[PDB]
Design a binder for these strands. Structure first.
Ligand SMILES: NC[C@H]1O[C@H](O[C@H]2[C@H](O)[C@@H](O[C@H]3O[C@H](CO)[C@@H](O)[C@H](N)[C@H]3O)[C@H](N)C[C@@H]2N)[C@H](O)[C@@H](O)[C@@H]1O
Ligand SMILES: NC[C@H]1O[C@H](O[C@H]2[C@H](O)[C@@H](O[C@H]3O[C@H](CO)[C@@H](O)[C@H](N)[C@H]3O)[C@H](N)C[C@@H]2N)[C@H](O)[C@@H](O)[C@@H]1O
Lengths: 275, 275
DNA sequence: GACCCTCCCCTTAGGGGAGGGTC
DNA sequence: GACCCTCCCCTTAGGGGAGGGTC
């Protein structure tokens, strides 16, 4: 015998007016009475029960046209719909959960770049392993290597990590080169950062890693004059301190920013392993 | 010296054409060259680097106008933005994680209702505790009690669980009543299903629970003729098997469906505790 | 005054599709 | 032929606000 205006319901049910009006329009929840002249909406007390579900499902995030299907459902049938919701949640849980490790690790790798002891000078250091995806570089050089050169590797990684490599890598044979002009990349690769499977990897992609070990490194900010010089510096450090190299030179390039409105700049790192 | 059409980039970067066009419109990522007559878009190989971030941030779910702010940021500053993302993730993780327990528990309570040994007959059984929110019922009766009668309790629960009670409860003193006409509810309550804090609960709300114990129950599907009868049945079962009651009668009403296009139906349960 | 009505413009990140024109 | 262009209509769950009228 008590009837509620939209305002009354709104306050009562902690749902907004514009919201009830909306739910009225999509015929998910309609007033018991619409005065035909004033088009005012009036609601019975016994209606409010229909909101409990709506409100819940909303909180869960069920889309509206979907609630409508849910309303009809009988107790046993609704139960199942819930466990559907349960499974859908576990997914998001996984998906984020994964992302959390990913980002913490992206961050961990960004740290070293800012904590690098000095630029332009060579030093040795003890390195954790880095897993990576590589492919034969088909006669590519520092000179003519392209971004596009990476696109297949980059599919795989994205399909795997979801989270595109900040980084670009290539390797080549440690030699007394005298010229950029003399150098060819053996493979080019990009680091993976998930231990998530890589479905349907084709066999022209080797999964391998930059082994744990001790490394003569040198790292600077790119510019053409320095590239070759710093390589030189490296070779020298080896030959002088008289060491035995046991890998290629690994070279990794990392943007310092992605502003398309500032001049491009990149951090380069050449490392190599020793006995 | 190699330039890419939108199609070329799209395939290269595994981003859609309509997507690059869009990113062009919002000046997040613009081609290096737009032919002035054909309005064809052309891109440099050295541009594709700007997509790695975009693509990542997208995967993380960063909104676009926000990526723009991120692009300018310097390595140290970007690092922080990430940990912002890290914290924002942990929230969702919590939020869902909570929901998962909630739903598993909503489900657990829905089960018993469908696994209830028989309807209309009384039996005793051993009950887990049920926490709940209640309030003095201010002389309310089975006769005149309303949905609205619950609205404050229901705020609290929603503010706490997010997930509106499927259920509605009231209690009253076990007596040889002869009439619905004789009955008053002592409190009316609604079960909580989170152990999450209930911020700024006002003191006219008692947090308490339906204690763990042994209970004479009876549960049926509502209709006016049966209500009082089944109560009667209950009283009788006690008096005959000669038992001592140690609580009020708890009464709980639960919709069987929320279809607003079928006749309303409800499951009632009256239980009481014994020594 | 305080509610309530309808109606209209607004948001995100594009996809689908038309009706051209181009490489 | 296969690319690419612009332009337009579409989606979700409403909120904000106008310009009335009503309880
Ligand atoms: N590793 C080659 C890389 O190409 C791009 O850019 C990096 C290159 O190394 C530079 O290219 C060359 O610059 C000069 C003339 O081109 C040469 O003297 C020099 N030896 C080369 O390094 C480029 N311009 C900037 C940045 N350093 C990408 O970031 C990455 O796809 C890829 O890994
Ligand atoms: N507990 C009272 C409850 O009111 C509503 O509905 C339930 C009531 O119990 C019924 O009300 C009464 O129906 C008859 C005439 O009104 C009476 O003879 C009977 N004794 C009463 O129970 C109602 N119509 C259906 C459903 N059972 C709500 O679900 C809930 O807010 C609240 O808990």
């Amino acid at each position: 015998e008590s009837y509620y205006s939209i305002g009354e319901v709104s306050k009562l049910a902690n749902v907004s007016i514009k919201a009830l009006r909306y739910y009225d329009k999509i015929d998910l929840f309609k007033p018991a009475y619409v005065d035909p002249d004033t088009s005012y909406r009036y609601y019975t007390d016994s209606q409010l029960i229909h909101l409990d579900l709506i409100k819940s499902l909303k909180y869960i995030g069920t889309p509206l046209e979907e609630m409508k299907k849910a309303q009809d459902l009988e107790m046993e049938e609704l139960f199942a719909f819930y466990t559907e919701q349960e499974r859908q949640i576990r997914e998001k849980l996984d998906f984020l959960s994964a992302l959390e490790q990913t980002i913490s690790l992206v961050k961990k790798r960004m740290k070293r770049q800012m904590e690098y002891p000095a630029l332009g000078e060579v030093f040795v250091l003890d390195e954790e392993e880095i897993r990576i995806i590589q492919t034969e570089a088909e006669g590519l050089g520092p000179e003519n290597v392209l971004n596009a050169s990476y696109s297949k590797l980059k599919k795989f990684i994205e399909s795997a990590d979801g989270f595109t490599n900040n980084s670009y890598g290539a390797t080549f044979s440690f030699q007394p080169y005298t010229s950029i002009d003399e150098m060819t990349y053996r493979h080019i690769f990009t680091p993976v950062l998930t231990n998530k499977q890589i479905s349907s990897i084709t066999p022209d992609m080797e999964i391998t890693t930059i082994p744990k070990g001790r490394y003569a490194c040198i790292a600077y900010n790119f510019s053409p004059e320095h590239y070759f010089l710093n390589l030189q510096k490296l070779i020298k450090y080896i030959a002088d301190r008289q060491l035995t190299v046991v890998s290629d030179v690994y070279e990794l390039i990392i943007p310092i920013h992605y502003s398309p409105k500032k001049q491009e700049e990149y951090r380069v790192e050449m490392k190599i392993r020793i006995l």
